Amino acid sequence: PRYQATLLIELKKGILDPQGRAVEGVLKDLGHPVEEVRVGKVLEIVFPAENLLEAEEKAKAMGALLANPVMEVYALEALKELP
Numbered sequence: 001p002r003y004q005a006t007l008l009i010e011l012k013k014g015i016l017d018p019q020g021r022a023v024e025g026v027l028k029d030l031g032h033p034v035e036e037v038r039v040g041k042v043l044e045i046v047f048p049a050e051n052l053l054e055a056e057e058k059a060k061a062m063g064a065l066l067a068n069p070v071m072e073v074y075a076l077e078a079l080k081e082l083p
Contacts, residue, residue, distance in 0.1 A: 005059035006078035010040030010068050040072075046082065047050050055079060 011017050019039040027034050045062060049055035056079055063074030 001049065001051075002082040003052070003055040003059075004078075004080055004082050005047070005055070005062070005070075005076060006062045007043045007044045007045060007059065007066065008075045008077050009043070009063070009072050009077070010038060011071060012073050015071050021079055034071060042077075052079070052081065055081075 006056040011020075017038055023037040023039065024034055027037065027062065043060070043066065047055075049058055056076065059076050059079055060074075063076060067074040
Protein backbone atom coordinates (compact mmCIF):
# COMPACT_ATOMS: atom_id res chain seq x y z
CA PRO A 1 0.00 0.00 0.00
CA ARG A 2 0.96 3.68 -0.16
CA TYR A 3 2.01 5.21 3.14
CA GLN A 4 2.83 8.72 4.32
CA ALA A 5 5.51 9.19 6.93
CA THR A 6 5.67 12.45 8.85
CA LEU A 7 9.32 12.85 9.75
CA LEU A 8 10.57 15.64 12.00
CA ILE A 9 14.24 16.58 11.89
CA GLU A 10 15.03 18.70 14.91
CA LEU A 11 18.02 20.09 16.76
CA LYS A 12 19.39 18.09 19.69
CA LYS A 13 19.51 19.79 23.08
CA GLY A 14 22.31 22.32 23.40
CA ILE A 15 22.53 23.05 19.68
CA LEU A 16 22.18 26.78 19.04
CA ASP A 17 18.81 27.47 17.44
CA PRO A 18 19.17 30.99 15.99
CA GLN A 19 15.85 30.69 14.14
CA GLY A 20 14.15 29.50 17.31
CA ARG A 21 15.64 32.33 19.37
CA ALA A 22 14.53 34.75 16.68
CA VAL A 23 10.97 33.41 16.72
CA GLU A 24 10.74 33.63 20.51
CA GLY A 25 11.97 37.21 20.33
CA VAL A 26 9.38 38.19 17.73
CA LEU A 27 6.43 36.35 19.31
CA LYS A 28 7.17 38.37 22.45
CA ASP A 29 7.44 41.68 20.62
CA LEU A 30 4.02 40.73 19.26
CA GLY A 31 2.33 40.16 22.62
CA HIS A 32 2.60 36.37 22.53
CA PRO A 33 5.48 35.66 24.94
CA VAL A 34 6.61 32.03 25.04
CA GLU A 35 9.19 30.07 26.98
CA GLU A 36 10.87 28.33 24.06
CA VAL A 37 10.76 27.85 20.30
CA ARG A 38 12.70 25.09 18.54
CA VAL A 39 12.76 25.20 14.76
CA GLY A 40 13.12 22.06 12.71
CA LYS A 41 12.16 20.55 9.40
CA VAL A 42 9.17 18.37 8.65
CA LEU A 43 9.09 16.04 5.69
CA GLU A 44 5.90 14.41 4.49
CA ILE A 45 7.06 11.37 2.55
CA VAL A 46 4.73 9.21 0.49
CA PHE A 47 6.03 5.78 -0.48
CA PRO A 48 4.88 2.20 -1.18
CA ALA A 49 5.52 -0.69 1.22
CA GLU A 50 4.51 -4.31 1.86
CA ASN A 51 2.89 -3.60 5.22
CA LEU A 52 2.73 -1.08 8.05
CA LEU A 53 5.70 -2.69 9.81
CA GLU A 54 7.95 -2.49 6.75
CA ALA A 55 6.76 1.07 6.18
CA GLU A 56 7.89 2.17 9.63
CA GLU A 57 11.23 0.45 9.02
CA LYS A 58 11.72 2.30 5.73
CA ALA A 59 10.44 5.55 7.26
CA LYS A 60 13.00 5.29 10.05
CA ALA A 61 15.76 4.54 7.56
CA MET A 62 15.03 7.72 5.64
CA GLY A 63 14.91 9.71 8.85
CA ALA A 64 18.30 8.37 9.88
CA LEU A 65 19.59 9.40 6.46
CA LEU A 66 18.21 12.94 6.67
CA ALA A 67 19.31 13.69 10.23
CA ASN A 68 22.76 15.19 10.85
CA PRO A 69 24.32 12.82 13.46
CA VAL A 70 25.92 15.60 15.51
CA MET A 71 23.30 18.34 15.24
CA GLU A 72 19.95 16.59 14.87
CA VAL A 73 17.61 13.75 15.76
CA TYR A 74 14.69 12.59 13.67
CA ALA A 75 11.29 11.40 14.79
CA LEU A 76 8.62 9.46 12.97
CA GLU A 77 5.81 11.71 14.20
CA ALA A 78 3.18 9.88 12.18
CA LEU A 79 2.73 7.03 9.73
CA LYS A 80 -0.49 6.13 7.95
CA GLU A 81 -1.72 4.15 4.98
CA LEU A 82 -3.05 6.36 2.20
CA PRO A 83 -6.25 5.56 0.28
